[PDB]
């Protein structure tokens, strides 16, 4: 049950799971009804519509059902990394998309002291 957030296919956030409240620092009923775009830095912000349509038109994959790392924006302005997991799902004929996050913050903490040292 860890970070879960699931958007339309436009991009806007349907649900948003508690433990995604304390990993962004918003709120569910903040979330919900904003476009995912607000959870992740420049340039991927501005582009994230774009990605999100190219798949809706393409039919063509390139992270779906993949899993990797990418840096995500909290409230407050801090940027972390955090390996990413997207699924996709159909509901009432439209597409909805599910992101499934673990935070890596501490890993490339641990990694970085360990470099430094
Ligand atoms: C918050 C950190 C996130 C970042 C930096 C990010 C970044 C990106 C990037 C760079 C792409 C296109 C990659 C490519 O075309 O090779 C993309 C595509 C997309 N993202 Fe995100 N994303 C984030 C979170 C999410 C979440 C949580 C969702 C769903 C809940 C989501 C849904 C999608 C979808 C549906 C696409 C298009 C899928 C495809 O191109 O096959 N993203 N994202
Ligand atoms: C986006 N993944």
Do not use: C
């Not at 970070?3 to 296919?9: C, L």
């Not at 959870?39 to 582009?47: K, N, T, V, Y």
């Not at 063509?60 to 997991?85: A, E, N, Q």
């Amino acid at each position: 049950p860890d970070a879960m957030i699931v958007i339309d296919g436009h991009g806007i956030i349907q649900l948003f799971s508690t433990a995604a409240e304390r990993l962004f620092g918003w709120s569910e009923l903040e979330a919900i009804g904003q476009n995912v775009n607000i959870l992740m830095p420049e340039p991927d912000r501005s582009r994230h519509d774009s990605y999100i349509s190219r798949y809706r038109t393409t039919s063509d994959p390139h992270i779906i059902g993949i899993g990797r790392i990418v840096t995500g924006k909290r409230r407050d302005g801090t940027t972390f990394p955090m390996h990413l997991s997207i699924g996709e799902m159909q509901s009432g004929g439209e597409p909805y998309f599910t992101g499934f996050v673990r935070d890596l913050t501490e890993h490339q903490q641990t990694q970085a002291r360990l470099q430094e040292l």
